Amino acid sequence: DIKELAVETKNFSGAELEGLVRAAQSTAMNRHIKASTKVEVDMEKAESLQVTRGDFLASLENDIKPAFGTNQEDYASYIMNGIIKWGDPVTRVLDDGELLVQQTKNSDRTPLVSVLLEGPPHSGKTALAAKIAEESNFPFIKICSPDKMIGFSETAKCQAMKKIFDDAYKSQLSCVVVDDIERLLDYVPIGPRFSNLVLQALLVLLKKAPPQGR
Amino acid sequence: MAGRSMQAARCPTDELSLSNCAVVSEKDYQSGQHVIVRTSPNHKYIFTLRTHPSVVPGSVAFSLPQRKWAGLSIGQEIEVALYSFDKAKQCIGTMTIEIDFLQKKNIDSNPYDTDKMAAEFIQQFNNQAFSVGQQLVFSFNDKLFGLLVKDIEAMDPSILKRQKIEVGLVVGNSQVAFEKAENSSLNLIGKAKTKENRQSIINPDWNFEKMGIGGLDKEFSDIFRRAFASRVFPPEIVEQMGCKHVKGILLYGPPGCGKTLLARQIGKMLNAREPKVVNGPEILNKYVGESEANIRKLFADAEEEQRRLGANSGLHIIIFDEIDAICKHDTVVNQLLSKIDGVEQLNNILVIGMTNRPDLIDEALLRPGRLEVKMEIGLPDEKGRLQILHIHTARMRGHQLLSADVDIKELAVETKNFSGAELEGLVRAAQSTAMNRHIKASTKVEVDMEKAESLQVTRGDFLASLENDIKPAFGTNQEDYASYIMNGIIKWGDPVTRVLDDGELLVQQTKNSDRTPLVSVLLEGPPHSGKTALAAKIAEESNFPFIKICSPDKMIGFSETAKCQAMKKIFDDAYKSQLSCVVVDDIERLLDYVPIGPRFSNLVLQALLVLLKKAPPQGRKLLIIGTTSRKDVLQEMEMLNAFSTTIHVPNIATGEQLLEALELLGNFKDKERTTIAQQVKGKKVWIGIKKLLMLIEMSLQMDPEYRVRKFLALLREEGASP
Amino acid sequence: DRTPLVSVLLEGPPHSGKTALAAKIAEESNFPFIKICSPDKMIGFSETAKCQAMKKIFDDAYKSQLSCVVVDDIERLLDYVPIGPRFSNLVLQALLVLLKKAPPQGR
Ligand SMILES: Nc1ncnc2c1ncn2[C@@H]1O[C@H](COP(=O)(O)OP(=O)(O)OP(=O)(O)O)[C@@H](O)[C@H]1O
Ligand SMILES: Nc1ncnc2c1ncn2[C@@H]1O[C@H](COP(=O)(O)OP(=O)(O)OP(=O)(O)O)[C@@H](O)[C@H]1O
Ligand SMILES: Nc1ncnc2c1ncn2[C@@H]1O[C@H](COP(=O)(O)OP(=O)(O)OP(=O)(O)O)[C@@H](O)[C@H]1O
Ligand SMILES: Nc1ncnc2c1ncn2[C@@H]1O[C@H](COP(=O)(O)OP(=O)(O)O)[C@@H](O)[C@H]1O
Ligand SMILES: [Mg+2]
Ligand SMILES: [Mg+2]
């Protein structure tokens, strides 16, 4: 069926659908080929060369990698050893996250909501945000982390952050994560010596309604 | 019925734990009754109740699997309400249950009859509530298994009179289907084995041994499926389907891992031409008019063939190289893009791009229609090395010139981090040494026909050649150690024994653990106490295939960005091995610190802080060792939170230690030793080992009469308060 | 053999002949290779150039199997001035790093 395939591809660009269709045929037609000292086209089963649902499903999961769509590696290495209960605080945090992520999807007077986690160091406040993001179920999920800006100057950081935030305005729903806000600003208490060109952009960005109805 | 607030408890007996039924008191409920447990407004669970006398009234007991599944904790409050099942619809017909061994220590390969498992499951859990995703423990033949509910189906109407549901009631006529978990070794036999998610790919039956390529199977299959799969069917069918042939492939990986063979070998699988190599940097020739002229000349043959034969010519190939340099020049990139993509382009071409830098590659050149299929070729694992050695040593084994002592498995196990191009070199070196064995060439070059028979390559030939001929790239750095540990290691007291002992308790954890793929340790102490000489002595004994030392002496006069780039490059190189160990020493000098100000480079500190907390790709392990002399300064910058542990290397602080160290150094005689002991047995000592060595060397220069006097005067002058 | 590298610092009051006296010890050394690096030869140079000069001098000294390099007026080399204080960090770092790097084996 063609109707069903239009509900499992979310935020798929125009050309990637052509890509999926093209990749759904090589797998179907790669079965009916036998090679023995030379690739030889099969003869007995040459007929009945029909593309089947299996090809489409395999191509949708391991062939086309979308661009403006959910990732599968970013929030795969952050949460490392699952989450295990040790009292009330875990339940409280998870429930609050779920409430916020449902408000940001069934509301019309507040298109933008932001929440800040904090606590003492070495407490697990970066594996409790990726879990909320993965349970959000939003089509577009990115992760802006300082791990990919080693050695950058201030201007490069500003440009990268602006581009990442801009990319999030092209979908009907979006969730974004910022890790170690203290590291983006380069705080060092022999000082301080913060960067005033990144702190005057991070403040502005967090108050900017998306274009319309997003 | 309305609901009452109870308290969670622990299961009283193992038998009730296996029953999967929450234990309650008779005064509260009755056996067989089903209830719903509420932990939050959005958390509800259904359980089957069983009565046991030991359960205190007002509390509900749950087994460990139940608590984990429902997120319950002992002592937490829950709400319990009586639950009624609609047997007309909630009756269950069939189950699909994922069964896996509960304990890894008791895994066995013996077959299990699923038909008996279903009968036992029904006989036990009849008239019990089950929900999708429920985790429980099932006992069969005195064996414990972990069962996970996957699917639930409604029961059909009776004869007198397959809906999917989330929860229902199990009965005697219910059917159970068992499926082994992913990668499970459980063996299931019988008719109750129906499973789901049965989707895979069927590929042609290749014979890798006859080819030459070994250890690269999935990449070959995927490339053949995605790139060349649609250039062998008749031209009529492809026209009907409307497909468009792919026009690009980008393979990247370390140098010398079979990248070019993986293309040449597939070249002759299809009747076609041979590749025309084109170097990456050679195309950059001075001025325009030669580079463009040659670029045009590249495709002349293909254009002529297409004009002559139209859509019937054979395929051509162009094995690129170092595409990183040619792109980012811009004229060449634009010309290539126009030739491949646009309106005027050829349909009998296929560009294969190769490179070593995957990140520096340009973005505009990677997009559907252009180079699209990007693949990675990595270092071979044990099986790859075994197959490569088998294939590369077939001709010799066919002529009966290989001794029976040679074991391929042992060589594969010993050789670690070998790329694969060196594996060929090892065989050549072994053959060369074996041949040189029998050359009786003294006086004049001759041949020893007496022992020329059986020109074999015995294990000694391989091992003797593995240490003086082949130097792996991603391998041990065996020359640095001679410059750092200059005068051995001397055990001058208890502390040295302890510190070195720690060097094991960490080095083992990084090799035999999976919950901690990154460890760190910061060695520190007073100046001239021997810190940098105790890190190499541990990294060497760690027995790790890859070792490096990022000393600051190799970078003199560098600017901040250069140091950051160098450190990033070293760490990136270290990331590409199954095991590693990176030693960074004299951290204070890297930061460019000086007490006035203070002043330091604010960028290197941030780079170092970020690097010390970034885990490597999955399945690989790392270990970082530091070395510093100013601990308070490093604590002010908040740097001891990054490191996981620290050790304290002490200084010589007793007369006995001084005397014993002097003895072990073995320089002075007995009379002078006694005199020094008498003179120095009434004062405190605070001296570094390096300073002690330097003082001894300085004092040995004087004449024999006044050696002891000079040594004692120097020690007195050097002595200072702690 | 236990101390392939040795360094000694001469200090004293201003205009006490420290600069010239060391040249005497250097001459009496009889070492095959000798060299003196002084700020006088470096007038108007930039900070990035003096580091290269020092690196080249030490690299040349490494080659032989015996050497004796003399540096005079370590303070004036830094551009130190009592006011501030002020100086060049790069030169100080190069000096500190280069005073502990031993030469190849046997030299
Ligand atoms: N609430 C939790 N319950 C159980 N396990 C947890 C919990 N939070 C985190 N973990 C586990 O502990 C580890 C958390 O490491 P993580 O990198 O998140 O540390 P952190 O203290 O949050 O980091 P940082 O110091 O950079 O802020 C992961 O293995 C995660 O699985
Ligand atoms: N038990 C020992 N522990 C440490 N060093 C020893 C020992 N026995 C002998 N040595 C010698 O001590 C010297 C160690 O000096 P090292 O290079 O570690 O200096 P350091 O204390 O790190 O100096 P710095 O303050 O400049 O960093 C080496 O020559 C080593 O041969
Ligand atoms: N006995 C002596 N010892 C040392 N220098 C002497 C002596 N007699 C004469 N001189 C002269 O004194 C001078 C000492 O050298 P010079 O003046 O360069 O050193 P300095 O005054 O320490 O320099 P600076 O002030 O820059 O450190 C030389 O001209 C040397 O020949
Ligand atoms: N997977 C493999 N199996 C067998 N031999 C291999 C394999 N990979 C590389 N080799 C050997 O190493 C050499 C690889 O050279 P090549 O890959 O062309 O160099 P480069 O990787 O620099 O292009 C070949 O001669 C081949 O015999
Ligand atoms: Mg973190
Ligand atoms: Mg040292």
Distance between Cα A82 and ligand 1 center (Å)? 9
B327 burial level (CB within 10 Å; 0-12, 13-18, 19+)? buried
Site of tokens 């088998």: B390
Core vs surface per residue B23-33: b (16+ CB within 10 A) or e: bbbeebbeeeb
Angstrom distances, CA of residue B70 to CA of B57, B74, B650: 22, 12, 53
Q: Partners for A (CB, 8 Å, 3+ pairs)?
A: B
Tell me if residue C99 falls in helix, strand or coil: coil
Q: Do B602 and A193 touch (CB under 8 A)?
A: yes
What lies within 8 Å, CB to CB, of A153 at 6+ separation is none
Task: Report how far residue C79's alpha carbon sits from residue B284's, in angstroms, rounded to the nearest whole number.
Answer: 46
Experimental method of this PDB entry: cryo-EM
- Tokens 């190939």 map to which residue? B317
- What residues form DSSP beta bridges with B112? B188
Q: DSSP secondary structure string, A57-121? A: HHHHHHT---SSS--SSHHHHSS-S-----SHHHHHHHHHHHHHHHHTTS-SS-S--------SS
Rg (CA), chain B: 37
Edge-to-edge strands of the sheet including B135-140? B135-140, B143-154, B92-101, B175-180
User: Distance between CA B626 and CA A91 in Å, rounded?
Assistant: 39
Distance A10 CA to ligand 5 centre (A): 30
Query: How far apart (Å, rounded) are the C-alpha atoms in residues B93 and B374?
Result: 48
E strand or H helix that includes residue A200: helix A199-205
Mutate which of B689, B695, B696 for ligand 2 pocket (most atoms within 8 A of beta carbon): B689
Residue C52 has its nearest CB partner, among B557, B592, B596, at B557
Closest to A98 measured CA to CA, from A139, A131, A141, A142: A131
Catalytic residue from among B150, B374, B631, B690: B690
- Please report where in the chains the tokens 């205009």 appear, as a residue: C15
CA B304 to chain centroid, in Å, comes to 50
Whether ligand 2 lies within 6 angstroms of the CB of B528 is answered as yes
- CB distance B633 to ligand 2 below 6 Å: no
In whole angstroms, what is the distance from residue B221 CA to residue B207 CA? 12
Angle at B83 between CA B82 and CA B89, to 5 degrees: 160
CA dist., res. C57 & res. C77, Å (int): 15
Element (H, E) at B6: strand B4-10
Give A86's contacts (C-beta < 8 A, 6+ positions apart): none
Torsion angle, alpha carbons of A149, A154, A155, A158, to 10: 70
Amino acid at A76: A
Report the b/e string of B680-714 with b at 16+ CB within 10 A: beeeebebbbebbbbbbeebeeeeeeebbebbeeb
Tell me the DSSP string of B581-599: -EE---HHHHTT-BTTTTB
Q: Measure Cα distances from B106 to B14, B114, B139 in Å.
A: 18, 19, 13
User: In whole angstroms, what is the distance from residue A211 CA to residue B712 CA?
Assistant: 83
- Measured from the Cβ of residue B7, the count of other Cβ atoms closer than 10 Å reads 14
- CA pair distance A70, A79, nearest whole angstrom: 16
By the 8 A CB rule, do B94 and B114 touch? no
Which backbone phi and psi does B633 adopt, to 5 degrees? -60, -45
Run of H or E residues at B509: none
Phi then psi dihedrals of residue C68, to 5 deg: -155, 100
Residue pair B291/B410 in contact by the 8 Å Cβ criterion: no
| CA B84 centroid distance within chain | 52
Show the CA angle centred on residue B125, arms to residues B124 and B127, nearest 5°.
120
What CA–CA distance (Å, rounded) separates B577 from B417?
7
- Is B586 catalytic? The answer is yes
Q: What ligand has the least distance to the C-alpha of A118?
A: 1
CA distance, residue C19 to nearest chain B CA (Å): 25
Residue A210 contacts residue A112 (beta carbons within 8 Å): yes
Q: Is the four-CA dihedral B486, B492, B497, B499 of positive or negative sign?
A: negative
Residues of B in contact with A80 (CB under 8 A): 615
Query: Which of B216, B217, B261, B264 has most ligand 4 atoms within 8 Å of CB, for mutation?
Result: B261
- Hey, what are B540's tokens? 């060497």
In the numeric block, the tokens 């004293």 are attached to C12
Asked whether the beta carbons of B147 and B140 are under 8 A apart, the reply is: no
Please, are residues B45 and B37 in contact by the beta-carbon 8 Å criterion?
yes
Tokens of B652: 């010589």
| Cα–Cα distance measured from residue A30 to residue B224, given in angstroms and rounded to the nearest whole number | 9
H or E element, residue B130: strand B129-131
Ligand 6: centre distance to CA A88 (Å):
50
Whether B690 sits among the annotated catalytic residues: the reply is: yes
Q: Which phi and psi (to 5°) does residue B350 adopt? A: -155, 110
Give the residue among B266, B91, B115, B138 at the shortest CA–CA distance from B193: B115
Residue B692: half-sphere exposure toward Cβ, Cα within 13 Å? 22
Closest ligand to the CA of B492: 2
Nearest alpha carbon to residue B112 among B140, B138, B131: B140
- Please tell me what resolution, in angstroms, this structure has: 3.9
Counting Cα atoms < 13 Å in the Cβ hemisphere of C103 gives 18
Chain B residues with CB under 8 Å of C48 CB are 557
The Cα diameter of chain C in Å comes to 45
The answer for B444, left when phi > 0, alpha when psi is -120 to 50, beta otherwise, is beta
Q: Is the CB of B248 under 6 A from ligand 2?
A: no
Residues of A within 8 A of B603 (CB-CB) are 151
- Identify which of C2, C51, C97 has the shortest CB distance to residue B552: C97
Q: What tokens appear for A119 in the block?
A: 């606590």
Q: Which ligand is nearest to the CA of B690?
A: 2
**DSSP annotation string for B390-417:** HHHTSHHHHTT-S-TT--HHHHHHH--S
Phi/psi of residue C83, each to 5°? Answer: -65, 150
For residue B532, indicate whether it is catalytic.
yes
